[PDB]
């Protein structure tokens, strides 16, 4: 019943079980491949976009902060540099806090994913982001945004990435 992965490091089986119940029909019954990991490939946003640039299927983002909280997003499109917001309403944010919560689209706006040379972010609605990351994958921020109506995904609004992974279904 639990899914097949080609390796793993931030997720234990109880995280795999609870995520795999929620992923869309698009990606049910596919093995998970590790596209990027800070622990395998070194730590930078330019490396994350470089490893993602060949992809053409959805991705799961997993983050562990320095307070050990696990959170991230499921995103309908790979993380790429974009002039404007992109993605579709099957995108969601999630956290284990320590109980698993998932914040699917509110229907209010389509500000799902935005990538820049110096940051990656998800959500919108004023100055808010459900998840923002710096060029180093060192500082990030999470606050409630009206795209997802999310909680704070970390233990704090402002956080340090301990480590980060991007998985693709392929």
């Amino acid at each position: 019943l639990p899914i097949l992965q080609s390796h793993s490091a931030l997720l234990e089986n109880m995280h795999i079980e609870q995520l795999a119940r929620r992923l869309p029909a698009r990606v049910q019954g596919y093995p998970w491949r590790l596209a990027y990991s800070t622990l395998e490939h070194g730590t930078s946003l330019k490396t994350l976009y470089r490893k993602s640039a060949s992809l053409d299927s959805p991705v799961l983002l997993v983050i562990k902060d320095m307070d050990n909280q696990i959170f991230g997003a499921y995103a309908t499109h790979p993380f790429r540099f974009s002039d404007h917001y992109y993605g579709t309403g099957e995108t969601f944010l999630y956290t284990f806090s320590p109980n698993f919560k998932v914040f699917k689209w509110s229907g209010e706006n389509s500000y799902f994913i935005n990538g820049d040379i110096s940051s990656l972010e998800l959500g919108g609605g004023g100055g808010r982001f459900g998840l923002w990351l710096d060029a180093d994958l060192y500082h990030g921020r999470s606050n409630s945004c009206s795209t997802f109506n999310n909680d704070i995904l970390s233990k704090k609004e402002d956080f340090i990435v301990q480590d980060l992974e991007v998985w693709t279904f392929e």
């Binding site: 579709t88 309403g89 389509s110």
Partner: protein
């Protein structure tokens, strides 16, 4: 015209992915045709109760862009069916060829 070609394509992908499920399940074509579902409801219920899925296909995009979103996903389902069907049929062929060498002449056995 572009939609008229795309309808004939996706109707074909629907007929292929339904037919190959009857080839896999084997038990009876009417029981398979009765046990087809979309969104976990009977197809007559699905069509009768239709509402556009905003999440999968965005309303506020152009008709052309929505058409291409539907075409890409259907093309993926077609390719992945072809891959999985080929990989499954190989086991079915090989297992039958071992059975054909339990059968046959004392020369071929």
């Amino acid at each position: 015209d572009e939609l008229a070609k795309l309808d004939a394509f996706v109707e074909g992908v629907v007929k292929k992915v339904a037919q190959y499920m009857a080839d896999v399940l084997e038990d009876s074509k009417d029981k398979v045709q009765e046990n087809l579902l979309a969104s976990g409801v009977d197809l007559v219920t699905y069509i009768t109760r239709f509402q556009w899925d905003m999440a999968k296909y965005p309303i506020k995009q152009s008709l052309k862009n929505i058409s291409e979103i539907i075409a890409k996903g259907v093309t993926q389902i077609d390719n992945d069916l072809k891959s999985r069907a080929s990989a499954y049929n190989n086991l079915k062929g090989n297992l039958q060829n071992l059975e054909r060498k339990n059968a046959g002449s004392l020369l071929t056995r």
